[PDB]
Amino acid sequence: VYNDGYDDDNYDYIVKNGEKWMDRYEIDSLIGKGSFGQVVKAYDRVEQEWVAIKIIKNKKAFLNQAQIEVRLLELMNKHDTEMKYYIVHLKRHFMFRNHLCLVFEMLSYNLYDLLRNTNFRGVSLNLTRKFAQQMCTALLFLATPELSIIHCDLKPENILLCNPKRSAIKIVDFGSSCQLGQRIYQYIQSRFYRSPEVLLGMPYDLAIDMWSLGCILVEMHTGEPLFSGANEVDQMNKIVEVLGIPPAHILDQAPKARKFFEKLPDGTWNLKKTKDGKREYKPPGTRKLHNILGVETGGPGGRRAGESGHTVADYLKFKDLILRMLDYDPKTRIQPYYALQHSFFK
Numbered sequence: 001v002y003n004d005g006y007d008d009d010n011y012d013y014i015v016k017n018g019e020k021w022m023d024r025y026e027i028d029s030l031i032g033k034g035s036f037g038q039v040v041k042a043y044d045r046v047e048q049e050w051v052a053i054k055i056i057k058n059k060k061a062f063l064n065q066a067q068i069e070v071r072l073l074e075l076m077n078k079h080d081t082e083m084k085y086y087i088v089h090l091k092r093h094f095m096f097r098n099h100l101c102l103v104f105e106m107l108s109y110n111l112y113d114l115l116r117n118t119n120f121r122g123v124s125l126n127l128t129r130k131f132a133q134q135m136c137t138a139l140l141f142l143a144t145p146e147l148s149i150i151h152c153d154l155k156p157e158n159i160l161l162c163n164p165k166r167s168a169i170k171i172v173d174f175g176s177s178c179q180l181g182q183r184i185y186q187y188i189q190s191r192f193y194r195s196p197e198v199l200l201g202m203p204y205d206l207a208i209d210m211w212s213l214g215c216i217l218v219e220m221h222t223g224e225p226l227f228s229g230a231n232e233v234d235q236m237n238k239i240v241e242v243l244g245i246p247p248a249h250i251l252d253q254a255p256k257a258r259k260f261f262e263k264l265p266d267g268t269w270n271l272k273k274t275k276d277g278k279r280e281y282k283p284p285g286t287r288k289l290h291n292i293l294g295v296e297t298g299g300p301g302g303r304r305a306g307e308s309g310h311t312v313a314d315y316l317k318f319k320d321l322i323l324r325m326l327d328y329d330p331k332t333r334i335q336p337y338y339a340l341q342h343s344f345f346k
């Protein structure tokens with residue numbers, strides 16, 4: 001009925017465990033599914049190693065976006081082995097039965113699965129520091145002028161562990177990514193990790209990934225998302241609870257500024273007033289990250305009192321770096337090279 005019987009009604013390849021492709025790949029199991037298509041675990045019989053295969057939907061719009069993804073991955077390969085790693089390596093791409101397939105190295109589970117393994121108690125600040133250092137190094141690689149790649153969907157699920165017993169991680173899935181001079185989407189990033197400039201409908205650059213990283217790092221240590229908005233208005237309001245009203249010079253140039261805020265006659269911006277006798281959000285900037293992290297009270301849940309790398313000085317350094325990553329202004333938000341110089345690391 002669809003693609004000579006190889007596709008379902010949603011342009012997806014019907015995965016059958018054990019099938020052999022091109023006398024090379026033995027499909028093992030379904031790993032996951034997304035809007036792009038599916039991801040399967042497979043054994044490369046020629047190279048004798050496990051691989052992950054992204055099976056793109058047999059539909060032109062998804063094929064074309066994956067062709068951009070392949071070009072970006074290949075651009076990173078011309079620099080690869082010669083620059084910051086911490087990025088999932090594209091091993092091969094090919095067409096198979098009207099599906100574009102992307103072969104990657106097979107890694108372990110993602111950082112959200114790690115959080116779930118701890119029952120969302122969070123991981124230590126020492127492990128968070130290691131994750132932060134590797135991700136800042138990976139963002140520095142993307143910031144290479146010839147690359148200038150914006151990932152556009154950084155989240156715990158898109159950061160994979162190399163080995164479930166080690167701290168090595170890699171960024172995965174550049175299916176929504178773009179170069180700085182080639183921006184085509186505006187509804188980008190997962191909502192919890194969406195930058196203010198994207199929420200405000202402003203032009204964005206590579207700084208949006210650094211905003212996502214700040215949200216990710218706090219969640220990794222606390223076990224819970226920092227800004228868990230159910231919609232765009234709720235997301236902006238949860239950001240304002242912690243960070244306050246964005247600067248006026250930003251809101252004055254934001255096309256969607258009045259979707260969340262109001263400009264009083266004095267030129268000062270305020271939040272749009274909620275309705276009737278409904279409970280208000282915390283006043284702007286009163287949900288202090290200082291207390292979300294438990295800087296003076298033994299960390300999240302008080303579980304870190306006396307733990308090495310969890311001194312008050314350590315939490316003050318971590319809080320400072322996060323606030324630099326959560327700068328409202330994308331032109332002054334901390335950049336990957338200078339995040340790596342932060343005293344949180346050395």
Ligand SMILES: O=c1c(O)c(-c2ccc(O)c(O)c2)oc2c(O[C@@H]3O[C@H](CO)[C@@H](O)[C@H](O)[C@H]3O)c(O)cc(O)c12
Pocket residue numbers: 031032034039052054088104105106107108109110113157158159160172173
């Ligand atoms: O080695 C891999 C691996 O172990 C995994 C993987 C592990 C653990 C999971 O719980 C999982 O759902 C996927 O996915 C991979 C991929 O899929 C990504 O998965 C993410 C979830 O983490 C989604 O967010 C992305 O959309 C999706 O592309 C790849 O594109 C490439 C890979 O090399 C792997």
